[PDB]
Ligand binder design. Structure first.
Ligand SMILES: [Ca+2]
Length: 123
């Protein structure tokens, strides 16, 4: 889910606006992704892309039309830690864990100015 993935990175990074700061960064952070990741932040987004790829080949996710972005799920942010809820059914619980690992990865890697809006001739 986009707005829930947005909310989870703000849980870990209270000062950012993820849809401005982390959209269109490198080769993978954003819509699609291809080529070799340019740094570790970008490698966080490759893994996140691969994890939503996993979820699509899940039998459980198949009947879900509003796919890995508009479909939702439920989680909570409490003292800057993300908890995915047990009332999530199988597809949404896999999506919530994909998104939860991406937001922790984001908070743990250096952010490189030079890669924001990287020319996709580099990917
Ligand atoms: Ca991507």
């Amino acid at each position: 889910a986009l707005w829930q993935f947005n909310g989870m990175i703000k849980c870990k990074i209270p000062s950012s606006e993820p849809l401005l700061d982390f959209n269109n960064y490198g080769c993978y952070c954003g819509l699609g992704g291809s080529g070799t990741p340019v740094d570790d932040l970008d490698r966080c987004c490759q893994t996140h892309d691969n994890c939503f790829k996993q979820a699509k080949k899940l039998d459980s996710c198949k009947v879900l039309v509003d796919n890995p972005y508009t479909n939702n799920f439920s989680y909570s942010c409490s003292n800057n830690e993300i908890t995915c809820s047990s009332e999530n059914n199988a597809c949404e619980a896999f999506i919530c864990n994909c998104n939860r690992n991406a937001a922790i990865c984001f908070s743990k890697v250096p952010y490189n100015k030079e890669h924001k809006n990287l020319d996709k001739k580099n990917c």
